Amino acid sequence: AAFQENVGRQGTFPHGIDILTTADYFAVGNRSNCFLVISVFIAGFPEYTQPMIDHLVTMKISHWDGVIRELAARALHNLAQQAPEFSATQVFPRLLSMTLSPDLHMRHGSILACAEVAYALYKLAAQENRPVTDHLDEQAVQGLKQIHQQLYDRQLYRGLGGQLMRQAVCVLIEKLSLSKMPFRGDTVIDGWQWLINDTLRHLHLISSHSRQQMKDAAVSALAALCSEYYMKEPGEADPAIQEELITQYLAELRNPEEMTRCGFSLALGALPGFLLKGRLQQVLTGLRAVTHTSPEDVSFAESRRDGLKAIARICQTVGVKAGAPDEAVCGENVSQIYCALLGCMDDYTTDSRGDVGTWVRKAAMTSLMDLTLLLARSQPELIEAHTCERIMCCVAQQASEKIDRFRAHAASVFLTLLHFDSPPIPHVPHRGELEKLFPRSDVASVNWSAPSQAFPRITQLLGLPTYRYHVLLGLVVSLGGLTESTIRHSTQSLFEYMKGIQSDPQALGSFSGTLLQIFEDNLLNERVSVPLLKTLDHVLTHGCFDIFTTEEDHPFAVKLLALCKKEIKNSKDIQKLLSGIAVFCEMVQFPGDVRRQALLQLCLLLCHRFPLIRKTTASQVYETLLTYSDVVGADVLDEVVTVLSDTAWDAELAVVREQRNRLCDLLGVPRPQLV
Amino acid sequence: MRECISIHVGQAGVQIGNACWELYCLEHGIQPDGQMPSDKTIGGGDDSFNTFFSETGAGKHVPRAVFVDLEPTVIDEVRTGTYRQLFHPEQLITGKEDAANNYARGHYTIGKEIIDLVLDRIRKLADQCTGLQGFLVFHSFGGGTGSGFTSLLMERLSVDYGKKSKLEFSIYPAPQVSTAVVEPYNSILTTHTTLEHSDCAFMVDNEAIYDICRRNLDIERPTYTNLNRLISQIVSSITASLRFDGALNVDLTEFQTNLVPYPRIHFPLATYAPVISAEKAYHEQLSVAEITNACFEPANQMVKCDPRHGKYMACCLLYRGDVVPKDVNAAIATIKTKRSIQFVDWCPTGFKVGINYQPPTVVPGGDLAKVQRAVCMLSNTTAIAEAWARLDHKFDLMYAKRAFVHWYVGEGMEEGEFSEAREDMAALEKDYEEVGV
Amino acid sequence: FFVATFVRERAAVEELLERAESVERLEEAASRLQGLQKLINDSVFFLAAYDLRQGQEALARLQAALAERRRGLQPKKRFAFKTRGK
Amino acid sequence: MREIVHIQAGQCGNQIGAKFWEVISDEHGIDPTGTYHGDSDLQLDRISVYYNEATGGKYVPRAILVDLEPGTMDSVRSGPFGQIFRPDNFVFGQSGAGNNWAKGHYTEGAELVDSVLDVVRKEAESCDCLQGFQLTHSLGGGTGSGMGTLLISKIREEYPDRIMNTFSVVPSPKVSDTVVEPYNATLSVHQLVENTDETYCIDNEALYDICFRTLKLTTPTYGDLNHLVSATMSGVTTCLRFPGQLNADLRKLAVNMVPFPRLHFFMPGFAPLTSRGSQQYRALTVPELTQQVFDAKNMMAACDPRHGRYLTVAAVFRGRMSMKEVDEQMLNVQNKNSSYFVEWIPNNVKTAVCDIPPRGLKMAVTFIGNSTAIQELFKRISEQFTAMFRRKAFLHWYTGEGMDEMEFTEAESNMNDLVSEYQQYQDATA
Amino acid sequence: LEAFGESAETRALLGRLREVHGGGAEREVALERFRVIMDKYQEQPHLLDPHLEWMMNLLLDIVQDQTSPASLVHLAFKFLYIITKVRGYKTFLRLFPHEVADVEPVLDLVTIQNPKDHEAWETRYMLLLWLSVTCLIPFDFSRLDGNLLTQPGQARMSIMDRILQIAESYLIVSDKARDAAAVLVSRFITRPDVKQSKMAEFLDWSLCNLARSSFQTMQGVITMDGTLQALAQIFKHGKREDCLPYAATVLRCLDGCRLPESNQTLLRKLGVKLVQRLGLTFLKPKVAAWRYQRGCRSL
Numbered sequence A: 001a002a003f004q005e006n007v008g009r010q011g012t013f014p015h016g017i018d019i020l021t022t023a024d025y026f027a028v029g030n031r032s033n034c035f036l037v038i039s040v041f042i043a044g045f046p047e048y049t050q051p052m053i054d055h056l057v058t059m060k061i062s063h064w065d066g067v068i069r070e071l072a073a074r075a076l077h078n079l080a081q082q083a084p085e086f087s088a089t090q091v092f093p094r095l096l097s098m099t100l101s102p103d104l105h106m107r108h109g110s111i112l113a114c115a116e117v118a119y120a121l122y123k124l125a126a127q128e129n130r131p132v133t134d135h136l137d138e139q140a141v142q143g144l145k146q147i148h149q150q151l152y153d154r155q156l157y158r159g160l161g162g163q164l165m166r167q168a169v170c171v172l173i174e175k176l177s178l179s180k181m182p183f184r185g186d187t188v189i190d191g192w193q194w195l196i197n198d199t200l201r202h203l204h205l206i207s208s209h210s211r212q213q214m215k216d217a218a219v220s221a222l223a224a225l226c227s228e229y230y231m232k233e234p235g236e237a238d239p240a241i242q243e244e245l246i247t248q249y250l251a252e253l254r255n256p257e258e259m260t261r262c263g264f265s266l267a268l269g270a271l272p273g274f275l276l277k278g279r280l281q282q283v284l285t286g287l288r289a290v291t292h293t294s295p296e297d298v299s300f301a302e303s304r305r306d307g308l309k310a311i312a313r314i315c316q317t318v319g320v321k322a323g324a325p326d327e328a329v330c331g332e333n334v335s336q337i338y339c340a341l342l343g344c345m346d347d348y349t350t351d352s353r354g355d356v357g358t359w360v361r362k363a364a365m366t367s368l369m370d371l372t373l374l375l376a377r378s379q380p381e382l383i384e385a386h387t388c389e390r391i392m393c394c395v396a397q398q399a400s401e402k403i404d405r406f407r408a409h410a411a412s413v414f415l416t417l418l419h420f421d422s423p424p425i426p427h428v429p430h431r432g433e434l435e436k437l438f439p440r441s442d443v444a445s446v447n448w449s450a451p452s453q454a455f456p457r458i459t460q461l462l463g464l465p466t467y468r469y470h471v472l473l474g475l476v477v478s479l480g481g482l483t484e485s486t487i488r489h490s491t492q493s494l495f496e497y498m499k500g501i502q503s504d505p506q507a508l509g510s511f512s513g514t515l516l517q518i519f520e521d522n523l524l525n526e527r528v529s530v531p532l533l534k535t536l537d538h539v540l541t542h543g544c545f546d547i548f549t550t551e552e553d554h555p556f557a558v559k560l561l562a563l564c565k566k567e568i569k570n571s572k573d574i575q576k577l578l579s580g581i582a583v584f585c586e587m588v589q590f591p592g593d594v595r596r597q598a599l600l601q602l603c604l605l606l607c608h609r610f611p612l613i614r615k616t617t618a619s620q621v622y623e624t625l626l627t628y629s630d631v632v633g634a635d636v637l638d639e640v641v642t643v644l645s646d647t648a649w650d651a652e653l654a655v656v657r658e659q660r661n662r663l664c665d666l667l668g669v670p671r672p673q674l675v
Numbered sequence B: 001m002r003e004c005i006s007i008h009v010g011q012a013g014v015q016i017g018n019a020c021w022e023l024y025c026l027e028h029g030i031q032p033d034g035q036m037p038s039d040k041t042i043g044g045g046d047d048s049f050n051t052f053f054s055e056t057g058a059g060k061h062v063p064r065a066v067f068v069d070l071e072p073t074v075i076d077e078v079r080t081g082t083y084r085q086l087f088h089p090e091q092l093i094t095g096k097e098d099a100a101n102n103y104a105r106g107h108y109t110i111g112k113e114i115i116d117l118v119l120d121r122i123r124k125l126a127d128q129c130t131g132l133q134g135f136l137v138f139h140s141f142g143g144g145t146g147s148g149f150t151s152l153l154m155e156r157l158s159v160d161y162g163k164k165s166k167l168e169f170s171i172y173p174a175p176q177v178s179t180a181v182v183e184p185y186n187s188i189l190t191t192h193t194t195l196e197h198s199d200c201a202f203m204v205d206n207e208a209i210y211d212i213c214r215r216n217l218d219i220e221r222p223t224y225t226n227l228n229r230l231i232s233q234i235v236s237s238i239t240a241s242l243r244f245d246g247a248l249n250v251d252l253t254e255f256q257t258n259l260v261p262y263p264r265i266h267f268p269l270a271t272y273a274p275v276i277s278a279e280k281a282y283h284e285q286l287s288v289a290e291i292t293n294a295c296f297e298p299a300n301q302m303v304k305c306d307p308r309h310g311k312y313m314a315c316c317l318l319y320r321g322d323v324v325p326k327d328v329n330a331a332i333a334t335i336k337t338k339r340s341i342q343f344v345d346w347c348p349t350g351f352k353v354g355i356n357y358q359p360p361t362v363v364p365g366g367d368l369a370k371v372q373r374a375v376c377m378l379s380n381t382t383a384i385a386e387a388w389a390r391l392d393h394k395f396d397l398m399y400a401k402r403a404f405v406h407w408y409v410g411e412g413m414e415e416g417e418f419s420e421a422r423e424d425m426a427a428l429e430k431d432y433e434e435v436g437v
Numbered sequence C: 001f002f003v004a005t006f007v008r009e010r011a012a013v014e015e016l017l018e019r020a021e022s023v024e025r026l027e028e029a030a031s032r033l034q035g036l037q038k039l040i041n042d043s044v045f046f047l048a049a050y051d052l053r054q055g056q057e058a059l060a061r062l063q064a065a066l067a068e069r070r071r072g073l074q075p076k077k078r079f080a081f082k083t084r085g086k
Numbered sequence D: 001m002r003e004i005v006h007i008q009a010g011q012c013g014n015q016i017g018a019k020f021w022e023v024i025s026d027e028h029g030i031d032p033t034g035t036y037h038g039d040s041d042l043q044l045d046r047i048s049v050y051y052n053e054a055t056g057g058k059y060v061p062r063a064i065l066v067d068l069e070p071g072t073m074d075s076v077r078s079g080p081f082g083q084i085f086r087p088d089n090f091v092f093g094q095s096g097a098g099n100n101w102a103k104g105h106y107t108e109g110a111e112l113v114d115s116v117l118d119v120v121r122k123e124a125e126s127c128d129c130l131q132g133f134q135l136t137h138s139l140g141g142g143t144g145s146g147m148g149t150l151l152i153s154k155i156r157e158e159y160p161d162r163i164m165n166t167f168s169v170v171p172s173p174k175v176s177d178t179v180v181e182p183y184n185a186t187l188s189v190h191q192l193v194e195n196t197d198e199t200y201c202i203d204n205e206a207l208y209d210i211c212f213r214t215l216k217l218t219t220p221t222y223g224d225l226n227h228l229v230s231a232t233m234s235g236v237t238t239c240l241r242f243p244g245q246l247n248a249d250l251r252k253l254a255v256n257m258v259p260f261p262r263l264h265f266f267m268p269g270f271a272p273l274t275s276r277g278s279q280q281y282r283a284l285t286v287p288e289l290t291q292q293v294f295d296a297k298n299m300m301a302a303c304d305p306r307h308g309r310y311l312t313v314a315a316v317f318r319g320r321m322s323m324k325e326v327d328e329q330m331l332n333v334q335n336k337n338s339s340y341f342v343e344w345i346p347n348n349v350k351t352a353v354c355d356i357p358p359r360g361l362k363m364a365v366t367f368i369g370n371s372t373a374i375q376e377l378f379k380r381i382s383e384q385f386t387a388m389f390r391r392k393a394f395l396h397w398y399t400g401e402g403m404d405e406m407e408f409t410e411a412e413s414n415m416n417d418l419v420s421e422y423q424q425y426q427d428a429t430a
Numbered sequence E: 001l002e003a004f005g006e007s008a009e010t011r012a013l014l015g016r017l018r019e020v021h022g023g024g025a026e027r028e029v030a031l032e033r034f035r036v037i038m039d040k041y042q043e044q045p046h047l048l049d050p051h052l053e054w055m056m057n058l059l060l061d062i063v064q065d066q067t068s069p070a071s072l073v074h075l076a077f078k079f080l081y082i083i084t085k086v087r088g089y090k091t092f093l094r095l096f097p098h099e100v101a102d103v104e105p106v107l108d109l110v111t112i113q114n115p116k117d118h119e120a121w122e123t124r125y126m127l128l129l130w131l132s133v134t135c136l137i138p139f140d141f142s143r144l145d146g147n148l149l150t151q152p153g154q155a156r157m158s159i160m161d162r163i164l165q166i167a168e169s170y171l172i173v174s175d176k177a178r179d180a181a182a183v184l185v186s187r188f189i190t191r192p193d194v195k196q197s198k199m200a201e202f203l204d205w206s207l208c209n210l211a212r213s214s215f216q217t218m219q220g221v222i223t224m225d226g227t228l229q230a231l232a233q234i235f236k237h238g239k240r241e242d243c244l245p246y247a248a249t250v251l252r253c254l255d256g257c258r259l260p261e262s263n264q265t266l267l268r269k270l271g272v273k274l275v276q277r278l279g280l281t282f283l284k285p286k287v288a289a290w291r292y293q294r295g296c297r298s299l
């Protein structure tokens, strides 16, 4: 406003109209624009090139906030292409003297400014078929080759303050290696290698809050340095340098520290393709073991994440090539990668924190998303049918968990692998039905993270026999959770879907079988067993399997009773016991010998070890007796209900065993023995 | 002649020290003001009761206590109480900010600001003594201040007075009286910090005192007032040898030599009997064999353990009343012939008998009756280790989920301290188990 | 060590101010306050909150004392027009 | 630590703040004039925690009325107890923030925060030892959210070691009809998890459902909403205004109710439920009160405790009763309803008794819980936020005031990671 | 926004105050809706100028009706105060009635007000402002009073004395009405006839209140604030040659109130404000000779 007033009332400000039309009440609102866009426009004139850069170098770069320092560095970078001489002759030497000051923030800002100036000068020289050494005189080359060395001489890399110097040195090394410097064959490269290696060998000593950053800043710096200096000829590298790096990194993937494992895993996924040629199978076999789970590596969930991240990263570097197992993705190594990727899917780890496995199950979902797609853009024939079907089944299964965050990523991955038409995927079970159920037009406006806008759509996949089992397993494990909205939306979608198959017998004879196979598939797992019993209880209480109740001794209930006997027997937690007592009193409705067996099991559970379980079983038995009909004959139901309501189930066992025996005798059920 | 210097820090520590001093003067006849009519020598001090009291040239019998609190609350009660004329203004130190149940906030933050003040008071008081035995510190594991400032003071004393004993009377946490969920962390921390700085520390299971008050005394809701009156009696009975002309545990080193064979195994088990209510005072008088048999009952034990399962390393008993040595010997022989008391193979298996002809004493209007004879049995039993076992159950379930750990990280305390304390506790448990072989 | 040196410098500044009778006394005293502030603002990346609050309170008290000393030793005269200066 | 400064931003915050002050004054016997006229020494044993002593033995409040417009500032000053406050404790502007978080956090708020930090340091200067802060604002309104979250950040940057507690009032489409309230709510959360230490969740949908279905009201008004919010505030702060050993200070309450830095959202509950102009002669027993306080209907948030797991529970019983019966009832409730309690934080249910029941009720009960079910209160916000942000609707109001989509992305990410952590901790060792 | 869109809704809400005044079930909802509709123009009150004339006519016809109960007139006073705080009193009271016949009725209303009724403070506030609007008439109060000795013994109190008593009684209340009184002080004590008969008295009372008030009690502070506001209004809206003969005496009492050492920030501001108005009374206003040659009025 002051500038506008001075330009309107005096008209003596150089380039008042220009700096007034670009910088106004609206354009000035954004700080990034003011520091990068508007800044360059205002500095384009010779009346604002020197003072602006001076203020940026003697104040903004030495701010007390990292964000302001980075913004000033980016501003200087953008303003380094409007003044190459001034940036390489008065500001660069000005920064070389400040990089050695005692202040930490000042040193960091000066290092960032020097790196940005070097990058800008290199970019400017690249557009004139000239080297970068022309602008950066011998003086500049010397100081830049003394930033990392001098810092190590004062053990400045130690401590919290030393972490920021380490990050600054990593960024400087990355910039220098990307700008192509004449540092090939010097001790500076050996010193840089050492610092990068130390940063990853000591990530457990880095703040968890500022950790993931220091690791993605050391791998990036390693990718530029090993692509500008480890190269003897076009498409090759120093045999000696390739034998020491790989041997050192593949021997650190088996470390006892998890942070070092993750660092080396990402340090092996950034290696250039010229340095993996000839020894790609070794690195592949190494990461495969890094993404595996042994009896000792059960809590190493973060290791598998970075392992899978690096694995797919090397597949995209080397690309696909025919007849080249040691250099690229051929047909001789495509199967092992798929097996290693699908070996991490069955990875659910309920550690103190919770499903840490979700992090490993997420990374895998990405590795495939970058693999099947890559081949689809080159050699789609390698995409096998069975492997692709298994991948599509695992994705559909993961797209129905109880975690909204990871259920939104799985749906996005599925949509990215189903709609893909550039070119499309060779083997996708029901690709026409999937396209009709998920219109590409009405997909970008679907909030998969919200259960309401995610469950009603994912439940429609049950119609496909291929994904039927994998979708039912997900719906089951999501129905027996604990969240109210999730369970409500799952039950609503299940009820709105079973209405079209309840009347059809063969439909209720295929879904029921699939659900009973999930019970035999996941028995004593303790992850699917609990939620599967609750789902069965809810389905029985809603009244879905009614056409089968007319038949006596139906195979479905016959096997369900045996599964419940094998599951509920020998337990401890109360939820499983209550969930088992509910399924039993719900299945009692089925007539025949199954009814007598269920009554016997209920009478047995009535005398549980805990009085609470006894009271719950008694209440459920009374409820299922007063609800259903024809379950007790000979007019002996009155005495049964009277002895059930009169007997105190909260007493001792010697006093309730007689009542249990009397109730069994009144119901025509053999009396269990006592040994 | 020698004199000790007692210290009371924290809310639980100072509240118990006040009752102990009240009971001590109640027994010595020292009036609330400090004048002792029974003392005929003015200015001179060389009797048995002088171990816990000094004398001015007017007659006043000042205690040798150090009441330090990090907040003005409990100190004000004693400053404007009944024995405020008993203590001096300098011995009643007070701070401002409270640790708020946090060992880190009291050991590396609000405790490193008042430690020097407490140390200057502990030096001025010692300068007025020709001979010093040790330091009787009273604190509690529940309170974060009692875990931080007490540990810091003990560590500083270990360097300053590096040739003086440091007997302790810690207070163990109980859910029926607790107000913090972080009492296991601070407890384990202070235990690991004091394991290498103390000689003999007696535990006081709050659950045992609550049960004794609800059953024996017949109280519906035992309060901190009733618990302090019952623990003060035991504290006085234990320190009765250091204040009367006896013949057992007359010095602090005697405690360590007769109850602490293994330097790291220094948590004996204390018991006191009988405990009759005031209503049933003039009813029946139990003999020595009656109060010696009940001492072994877990109901009277201070810690909820099972000494019958384990074995003993050392044992002693201190009587109070008209007790005859022959009757005590006969009762001990009968108990040995009846009960199957087992001792360690490498440890001496004998009971240190020490009778005190002085009759018991109780505060007027108290729930405890004026029994004719009482006894305090101190025996080092391995079963007491069980009291620590369950405590670890509260440290693994929480620490596994990293619960309430940020409070210590953000207060300057490191994270490896918890692992070190857990390893020390595991080593102590392993040593206890090995001693049972 | 940080708390030790801070307390030492605070005691030194207090002793220098208790005996300040020159503008050079107060001017040097007002350059130890700048140094202390610069040190503290460069050490808040590893210090606790209670220590920072104590340091801030000490700095505020020292600044108030310095302002009082400057107002006392150098009593600023009341406002008066420049009419008839000579 | 023995003096707490009170702050209130926005119209709802000021109204909720004025009601709580009136309630604690009527409970302590402090008439509108400022003189004590109660009938119990306990009322004066902890009077210096919220009031200041002044000549003539007067008790002056320690609050600071803050706004960007003058309406609410004049409404409270003219209220029945309006004279109690300080004439120089009212700091407000003229234009408001127009339901925009940016306008209230970067322009008018950023300009009035200077004067706000002047009265704040004026109250901290008259405090032997400041203990913490207690702000009362809403997450829906622009001025109430933006400038109030700007005052939390400024206090955390200024005062290094001081507890921060707030009474966030989550909006609800059933009460208000403004479309930009989802954005004004999400951003606020992104600040709390990274600024405030304690925060109570008082959902408006829960209050509306309790007033329309339980109390039987055809048109629940803002007068009914303030009647439920002030009672909850008086119930949750009963330990800080009267003697006690459980949670006498704010640091202890935080250490006992904050198991993790980011997880500190406590859903409060109070029973028996009442309304304006209603006297219940029937005195509920202790078992009935203990069973009703844990009911989802008596919860101020739209979350069912049964659909989750508890982490830290604190109950308070105000009224002449026995402690043994209360302890037995609490033990029975913990034993029976044991499945709803995490077994990895032993002794995570605290109970306290007080001899000063609220006004108009002989027996009262309180509930400050830290269950993971509170995540449901955020999931609802998530849906609205995402649905409104994907098509870019009414976004020019924010981008045109310095903000950008990066902040919304950041806040959405922080809130989403808070939900995942809650879900994980709820299923710890599954 | 651009214009007023909620015209019919606001008209219906204003025409509904005569059926939602008895029970408060439909009284609170109407006020809430009105406040929510008016808050949208808090930042653009200029967009209400063409609607704030007809809304004030509808609001005035209800309070002017003698058959309008207390509850009905108080409801119309709350809406008026809302509109005032929304748009602005300076721009809202200017359009209010200012005839001569409106001098006696309005005043009478101010006489039937209970200062201890916090449930209707909005009535005591706005009303006062309306009075200040009826002091911009170019006639004297003695002409409106006429003959005061019409009743035997008990004489009738003139309008000037009544206004002076009302102002003296409301410059010392805690509520928002004290402020309104300050408006009347700048419209009543600055009149030609009122100044001649109510300037020495009002300035002797203010000095006494300033001399016997403490900044350590709740009341004394309110009285000092009211007196300072009244003095500032007098020195601002008053003449320089009628107020200059008193600026030395006032300056002295202000300096004696030792305000620069009080912890009351609002008292210090009022003292500084009163210190600059008194000072500008000692010097004649000058005019910028440098205008008409260095810039236009706008840009």
Ligand SMILES: Nc1nc2c(ncn2[C@@H]2O[C@H](COP(=O)(O)OP(=O)(O)OP(=O)(O)O)[C@@H](O)[C@H]2O)c(=O)[nH]1
Residues within 6 Å of the ligand: B009, B010, B011, B012, B013, B015, B016, B070, B098, B099, B100, B101, B102, B106, B140, B141, B142, B143, B144, B145, B146, B147, B171, B172, B173, B174, B177, B178, B179, B183, B206, B224, B227, B228
């Ligand atoms: N026997 C007994 N236990 C007590 C007493 N006071 C507190 N406790 C217990 O001590 C533990 C807490 O210690 P406190 O003494 O309150 O704490 P503190 O040492 O003052 O610690 P901070 O206030 O945290 O600085 C809990 O287990 C209490 O039940 C008391 O007088 N007697």
Ligand SMILES: Nc1nc2c(ncn2[C@@H]2O[C@H](COP(=O)(O)OP(=O)(O)OP(=O)(O)O)[C@@H](O)[C@H]2O)c(=O)[nH]1
Residues within 6 Å of the ligand: D009, D010, D011, D012, D013, D015, D016, D068, D069, D096, D097, D098, D099, D100, D104, D138, D140, D141, D142, D143, D144, D145, D169, D170, D171, D172, D175, D176, D181, D204, D222, D225, D226, D229
């Ligand atoms: N419970 C309750 N909610 C209220 C109250 N007043 C407003 N709200 C809610 O607060 C939100 C609107 O915020 P306001 O408090 O009006 O906002 P503000 O702080 O005044 O901000 P600006 O309007 O932008 O100046 C909506 O969700 C309202 O329903 C009240 O008295 N009680």
Ligand SMILES: [Mg+2]
Residues within 6 Å of the ligand: B010, B011, B071, B098, B143
């Ligand atoms: Mg304490």
Ligand SMILES: [Mg+2]
Residues within 6 Å of the ligand: D010, D011, D069, D096, D143
């Ligand atoms: Mg508002």
